[model samples]
Target: HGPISPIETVPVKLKPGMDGPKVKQWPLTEEKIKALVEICTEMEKEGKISKIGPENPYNTPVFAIKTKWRKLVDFRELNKRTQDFPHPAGLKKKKSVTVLDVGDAYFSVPLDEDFRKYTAFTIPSINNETPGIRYQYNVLPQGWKGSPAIFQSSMTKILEPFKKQNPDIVIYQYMDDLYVGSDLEIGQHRTKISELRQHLLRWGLTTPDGYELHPDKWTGYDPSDLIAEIQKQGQGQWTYQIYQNLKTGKYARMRGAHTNDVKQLTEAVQKITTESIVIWGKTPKFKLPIQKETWETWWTEYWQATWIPEWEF
Candidate 1:
């Protein structure tokens, strides 16, 4: 029904890159401060968020207050130190997958209390008598740059037992919208769904609004022309612009040309190894190919980082 107080602490990024924590302090208004304190008080009471100790040095961003899309924190710097989530491009079909909502999923994976201070915020005074305060999150609150990704991984680990037991079933998740079903038929997952729900009994899994889900309902990802999509701008060999998915929010890259410059994307990836490359979802093992060859051993890894219980592709 609500957040959980973990038996053990779960940590968030305290030190982002070369920068230290709680360096900059963004000011808040009496109104924002009031709203902030109000929510934090409720969340703290419910074990969802926390108030930082005076000695705490870790500091992160405040959540976006009045945005249309979602309430997100501007943790641009902190997110640099976190792994990220991918769009549902690689996930499978509807009624085809058993959709389970891990109720209070974010808070279920407690933000290790030790690292919670890194996300601390300076809460403004509510009134003449009340003093300013510092607060942080005990749970992975929505909107932090790394929240989605981190929560995904945490939940996946929790569901691993059921996932392995029901190998015939598939699980698809984002934040808390978890799905499980057999690859054969979407309609046949009711029993499997019950089995999964029972497995997550201690944690609490919820049924979704839909009767069944299908990939047909979801829109296809264009990658915003991130890969296999670099336009020719004043065409030339050396002048070829390299376009990559570089973003703080999601996996999205649209800039220049590199795929067009070479025979294989292998070279582009080897050079730009900032994000460990996985070509069309498989990791490359051997050397690069000058002119494309149908190699037998495509790249593979034992454990790929993802929030889903297990990713088939």
Candidate 2:
């Protein structure tokens, strides 16, 4: 019902030398035409689309289907001419998964005003009384090829901070759908839900009307599923080792190199050890057992460079 704030209106990117055709509406019965016109008027009232003068050169066919009460624009030609956006393509199990569908996902995002003309669609008079006119979407159109990919990227960015703050919460976002999973008890799970709801509100994203998480829908996941997926994708020699500090009993996990590259493995190990101490505030006493020869001098210099007397770390 509302557009997300603090986001730039998305621009339509057409392929070079491409132009939208001035196509006509598909054949429709009198009753269907009226219904489609009414639908468009309702959407116009909601600021989803705006009526443009008949002079617009770009036009697309609009279909008013009987079943499903559908009134959709035929954007196939437009999609063919538009640039494609690549979508980057996550889950776990005792985890309860909550599925949420974002209502009118693409329409929730505003479209660039200057580019709206490219999305123009024409509608003929329903009863020969009203004048035929053209309208262009003010928000992202549903049938556009780039809509899903663009929206997915936008949602990912908006949810980044939430993901970072609640790293334990397993959430997967596919375009408009969100699957939030938690392996905690009821009390802890409820807290995560509250936080997620608040986050959705802040971004102006809404769920379907009367949407509820039924008890049966919160399914559990098994760790074995994740293990299988990882093993399948990483078809190589893989080893995971957990290192324990003999003195303090503290532990750190490091994935062994897949190949017999000792130099590469050592460099990676060195970087992780430094990151553990500097970024994660792990114990400075942790030693690089693999490089015991230069560990003393290296550790000394690392501390001196990282720890500042004043200012920030």
Candidate 3:
């Protein structure tokens, strides 16, 4: 026992579920528990006194500080009990933040020799004649936990020199997506793209041949347009109306009664509209009797038709 000393304490707020029995009884089984105890014992042996327990005042001040300083605190439960709504302060407010879909982009790169060998062979029990190629099948195995880390590490090595040389270029790699942020004009975007292309080339990563960098493709209305259209339609309102006039081949009346009769009426109108239009004027010709239902079906079919299965890894 030592003389009582004045203790400087900070108010520790517990999360909502922090005091729950489930949290209190979190298992400390297996090698993990032994490792933790070993760590504490080692610390004590090194003249670093430590205390371990729930929030209690009986422990020695020195030991309490040693033990609690590095303690793991679960604030999630406390947050729930306090009804704290967490909001992201960063990146959420940005007007235009480029998000490169790694999985989509990775398809452009060829697999390493080791990776190809690892994924190409069939199980020993299966017929050993090199596996038959399947359409859209991943030539390079992906969706693995280590894939992102591996890909990121490769990219990091390639970009490390640039990062060291140019402090102005901020390159942040998350998985396969690389975000390069700088306070430069549109010219900087082209520079960033060129830098990325150079890195990929150096690493023997495939860059799609004849890749055209379209400004419109980078700054499209996909996000806003979809959100606006959904909002305009309103929620929980289902009605059938002519979205496009087949006659004029333009947007039809914006407002109309939503009914089965109107649905049939639109289909008839679309047919007459398509036939009356001159062939030369009709760049994309359509036949009459186009069931309104065909629009959704045709849209999906057209999308699938445009998909290049061979392009997918």
Provide the overall lDDT of each model, using Cα atoms, as 2-decimal numbers.
0.46, 0.54, 0.31
Q: How close is candidate 2 to the true structure, as a TM-score?
A: 0.50
| Cα deviation of 115, candidate 2, in Å | 2.2
Candidates ranked by lDDT: 2, 1, 3
TM-score of each: 0.47, 0.50, 0.31
What's the count of clashing pairs in each model shown? 19, 2, 5
Decide which is better by lDDT, 2 or 3: 2
Number of the top-ranking candidate, with TM-score as the measure: 2
Best by lDDT: 2
Location of the lowest summed lDDT over 10 successive residues in candidate 1? 302-311
CA RMSD of all predictions: 13.5, 20.7, 23.6
**C-alpha lDDT (0 to 100) for residue 240 of candidate 1:** 17
